[PDB]
Design a protein around this ligand. Structure first.
Ligand SMILES: CC(=O)N[C@@H]1[C@@H](O)[C@H](O[C@@H]2O[C@H](CO)[C@@H](O[C@@H]3O[C@H](CO)[C@@H](O)[C@H](O)[C@H]3NC(C)=O)[C@H](O)[C@H]2NC(C)=O)[C@@H](CO)O[C@H]1O
Length: 129
């Protein structure tokens, strides 16, 4: 499913992401935009052999099990395919664990390079929240 900007904002808010760990909603929407272009089915393989999954491009080396990443840690205890669902619950629950792991949102390379330090509030402009 390819979410619309405000549609995603609403879903993430509903799932408790607004200001989770001090990160406003605009940060999460900006991250999803640049990580997957709001597409829940997005996947991208990395050089180390791991793969990033879904709306928030969660990596198989640490967070989920895809059965083909030797050394995967599976910290969110879920098959990576669960992160591609049209329902973002699994992705959100796992993201909460990731952002709490010590490096905050820096865990998302696109957030660090394209969202961090920008006016993220613009990402939720005009949305009925
Ligand atoms: C969204 C996504 O999946 N992002 C991936 C990153 O999570 C990953 O970065 C590495 O993540 C691990 C797990 O959070 C980091 O290890 C943690 O480091 C912190 C502080 O340094 C420490 O407090 C934690 O104990 C430790 N976690 C454990 C359980 O070992 C690790 O530092 C990150 N590596 C780097 C280079 O930032 C990167 C890299 O694989 O991939 C993203 O896709």
């Amino acid at each position: 499913k390819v979410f619309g900007r405000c549609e995603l904002a609403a879903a993430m808010k509903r799932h408790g992401l607004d200001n989770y760990r001090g990160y406003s909603l605009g940060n999460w929407v900006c991250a999803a935009k640049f990580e997957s272009n709001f597409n829940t089915q997005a996947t991208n393989r990395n050089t180390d052999g791991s793969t990033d999954y879904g709306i928030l491009q969660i990596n198989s080396r640490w967070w989920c099990n895809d059965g083909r990443t030797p050394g995967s840690r599976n910290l969110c205890n879920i098959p990576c395919s669960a992160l591609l669902s049209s329902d973002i619950t699994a992705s959100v629950n796992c993201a909460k664990k990731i952002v709490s792991d010590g490096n905050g949102m820096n865990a998302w390379v696109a957030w660090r390079n394209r969202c961090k330090g920008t006016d993220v509030q613009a990402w939720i402009r005009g949305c009925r929240l």
